[PDB]
A and B are shown apart, each in its own frame.
With several copies, the nearest count.
Chain A
Amino acid sequence: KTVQKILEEVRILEQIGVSHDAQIQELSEMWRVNQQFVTRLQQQLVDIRQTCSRSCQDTTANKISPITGKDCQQVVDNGGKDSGLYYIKPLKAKQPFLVFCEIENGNGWTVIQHRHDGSVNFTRDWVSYREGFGYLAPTLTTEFWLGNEKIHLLTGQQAYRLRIDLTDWENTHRYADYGHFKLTPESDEYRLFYSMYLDGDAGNAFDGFDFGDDPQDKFYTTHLGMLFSTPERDNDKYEGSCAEQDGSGWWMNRCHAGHLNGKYYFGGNYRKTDVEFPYDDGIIWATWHDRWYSLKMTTMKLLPMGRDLSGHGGQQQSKGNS
């Protein structure tokens, strides 16, 4: 009986194998489609190795104009049209440098300083204030101080008009114009010099202010003729150090009436209470708001003292398109 059972049993082990050869065949095909794919990838491997060899585009570098000149005005003359980054090169300038040009109505204002949000600490040293610090961008929305040497050499070439743009926290704007503004060389420190205050609706802060604390306030807060001073280099008219007390680089007299490089305070109104220097260290311009109101945005720009301008209208609003 164990003989007749080897008939079907076996016959089964044979009918099964058929599948096994129908399966071993399957394993082959797949293995190929695979080896086919694996190869299709090796291919996709190079296209990728390559398309990813290129590096990012510097869109800022990309927007720095090739146009040049003594200043931003020459830059307009020689072509400049849109406000932005240009490389200018003043007279004794030993190495040309990057600056923001504010081009409007054929006017090429070369920008010197600009406060905007408070992202840059302005408590800096003498070299920092002379070599310059802060940042530059395709749009005047960054904070910087061009550098005292650059401002010296610049206001040295020819006569420049200095316009100071002030904006408070209600986004109200006001300016102040000083003609023949210029800085003496580092030898004389960096004395602030201007012929006089031309005009402006902000007030004449550079000519001191009657704060009301003492009859001598205006005389002691006038900046005309003052020497520059940083927190580690005192050149004021104070027994103490205005710059160190106020953590800034400005033309301190018996301190200040206008302090555009002061500490940034959001909201305008600010109090002392903190460390121990119960004195106004904000971004002020006393002829408009008072010592404990720091301006929201600020800008100091230069334009050749030999232009035209005169077309700011002013008065009521109407000022504002888009």
Chain B
Amino acid sequence: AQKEIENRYKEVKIRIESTVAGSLRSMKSVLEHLRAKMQRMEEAIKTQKELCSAPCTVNCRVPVVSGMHCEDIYRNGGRTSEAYYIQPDLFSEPYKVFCDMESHGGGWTVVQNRVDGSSNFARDWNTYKAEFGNIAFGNGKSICNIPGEYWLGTKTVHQLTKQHTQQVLFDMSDWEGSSVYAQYASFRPENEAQGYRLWVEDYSGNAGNALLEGATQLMGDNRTMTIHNGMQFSTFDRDNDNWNPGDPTKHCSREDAGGWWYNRCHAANPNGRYYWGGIYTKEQADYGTDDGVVWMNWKGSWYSMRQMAMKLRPK
């Protein structure tokens, strides 16, 4: 009957003005909003680029007192935390470095440090070997006590530990306000030849023995394969991890955005991507991996620390 042509016009008239008219309505804006969002980014990158013509500079005065390591300085009177020149070897020009003279006893030579994502750690084997980043920043009074992000060269670290066995101490702070720490009585890496293999002894602290135990929230292989002790160093341009040797597809350094002592990847991943906020989904990571300043044993695989450092001290 007539009510037979209706259900042929009661649908078409509706789809045309509902589903179709609607999807068009909605989509448009969504597409417009994007062009908007992107319009910002371009004037962003370009405003900065416009400025990155000239590099930044640090014109801060240099502290008289020096030593051969941050501890030597503390011993000589360096009691404030800032930048100083040290000279661990008589046959090697002195180099600037950030000394922590307030955390756990003091005399700590900062080897690595994250605080504001002001530097990029996705560097190659030579950059990591030679050292990259800013030791410190001018506080305005021309005294450099604001620590910047950096990684003193692995070689440098190596030499330091070969001259005298060190003890490392890791510090980290979440974006909420809390902060734990982890230390090892012994620290020392073999020479480049050995891929700067990592060897640490005796854990202690409230962070979680991620170096000798790995991500203790795992079972069997899943945990052991996240142990950093005994591992060599890797960079995006040099795979030495324990993740399938010949296979160029298994590169922890490629997937976790940083130069580290990966072993079938990690438990502790400082040097990673500096996500801002703390939490970051598995979908935001360039390779769907838990990259970024991660210290599993304390905040899981999907929390990037707001602060992370690695200090060295003899005893």
Contacts and interface: CB of A to CB of B under 8 A. Distances in A.
Interface of A: 2-3, 6, 9-10, 13, 16-17, 20, 23-24, 26-27, 30-31, 33-34, 37-38, 40-41, 44-45, 47-49, 51-61, 64, 85, 87, 94-95, 97-98, 119, 124-125, 127-128, 131-137, 142, 144-147
B193 interface: no
Interface in B38-59: 38, 41-42, 45-46, 48-49, 52, 55-59
Given A6-B9, A13-B16, A137-B142, A131 B60 contact: no
B56 A56 contact: yes
B16 A20 contact: yes
A97 to B, nearest CB: 7
Contacts of B56: 55-57
A59 B6 CA distance: 83
Contacts, number: 146
B120 A53 contact: yes
A48 to B, nearest CB: 5
A51 B52 CA distance: 7
A95 B62 contact: no
A55 B119 contact: yes
A197 to B, nearest CB: 28
B96 A57 contact: no
- Looking at chain B's contact residues, the main secondary structure is mixed
Interface residues of B, number: 57
Interface string B197-232: 000000000000000000000000000000000000
A30 B35 contact: yes
Interface in B2-39: 2, 5-6, 9, 12-13, 16, 20-21, 24, 27-28, 31-32, 34-35, 38
Given A13-B13, A51-B52, A135-B143, A60 B5 contact: no
Contact of A31 (B31, B58, B77): B31
Given A23-B24, A98-B66, A56 B58 contact: yes
Contacts of B2: 2-3
A308 B73 CA distance: 39
B279 interface: no
A33 B59 CA distance: 46
A136 B62 contact: yes
The 10 A-B pairs at the shortest CB distance, nearest first, are namely: A131-B76, A128-B77, A135-B61, A56-B56, A137-B61, A59-B59, A132-B64, A30-B31, A57-B57, A136-B62
